[PDB]
Amino acid sequence: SFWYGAMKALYG
Amino acid sequence: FLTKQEILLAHRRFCELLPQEQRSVESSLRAQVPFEQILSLPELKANPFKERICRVFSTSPAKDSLSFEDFLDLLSVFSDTATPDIKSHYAFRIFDFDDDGTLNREDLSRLVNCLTGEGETRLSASEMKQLIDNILEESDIDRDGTINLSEFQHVISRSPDFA
Ligand SMILES: [Ca+2]
Ligand SMILES: [Ca+2]
Ligand SMILES: [Ca+2]
């Protein structure tokens, strides 16, 4: 899931 | 979203960014810290979207500085207590590169480029087209070519918890 990775990059 | 300890700690850190002459409480609450000083903070320095994050949380019309209140807003959204709804709402604003209210192919291309790096390791033209087509296939419910907020919040809510 592309969106999981993008949210993890932003909020992780 | 922030405790009193977090707010008081935020004010002390914010004040360390100001010239000595602007460190009184009243001066500090009027101060506008340029992005250059904000982008070096440990909370932001390693973030791939730091430049977009500054822009989104700025309340000055020139969108080129952060006040103390803007800085508390940023911390509030990035805190562990912020709800999934608020995180996906601000994520949408961050990913909306041209600030027109929808994520299009250009927005998605800039988002992918942020994730990989400016270039070497950059995606090729064909790799980018195939990735964007797949992202749109899963997210763009009305098939108009763009992803609006409700489409975005829906797709995020169906994804695993990035916790
Ligand atoms: Ca545009
Ligand atoms: Ca846009
Ligand atoms: Ca759409």
Residue boundaries of the structural domains of chain B? 1-163
| Chain B nearest CA to A3, separation (Å) | 7
Could you tell me if B102 and B96 are in contact, meaning their C-beta atoms sit under 8 angstroms apart? yes
CA distance A4 to chain B (A): 6
The Å distance, Cα B17 to ligand 1 centre, comes to 35
> Where do we find the tokens 């903070």?
B41
Among B138, B160, B136, B139, which Cα is nearest to B149's?
B139
B-chain residues near A4 (CB < 8 A) = 159-160, 162
- Measured in angstroms, the resolution is 2.2
- Residues facing B66 on adjacent strands: B33
Please give the method by which this entry was determined. Answer: X-ray
**Cα(B133) to centroid of ligand 3, in Å?**
13
Q: Which of B118, B143, B121, B120 is nearest to B133 (CA)?
A: B143
d(Cα B109, Cα B66) in Å, to the nearest integer? 27
Judge whether B151 is annotated as a binding position. yes
Give dist(CA B52, CA B9) in Å, integer: 24
CATH level 2 (architecture), domain B1-163: Orthogonal Bundle (1.10)
| Closest CB to B160 among A1, A9, A10 | A1
Computed from CA positions of residues B152, B153, B154, B160, in that sequence, does the dihedral angle turn out positive or negative? positive
Helix, strand, or coil (residue B82): coil
Per-residue CA distances from B22 to B2, B16, B30, B31, B32 (Å): 25, 10, 9, 7, 10
Residue B24 main-chain phi, psi, to 5 deg = -70, 160
Could you give the 3-state DSSP secondary structure of residue B126? helix
Tokens of B125: 């033209």
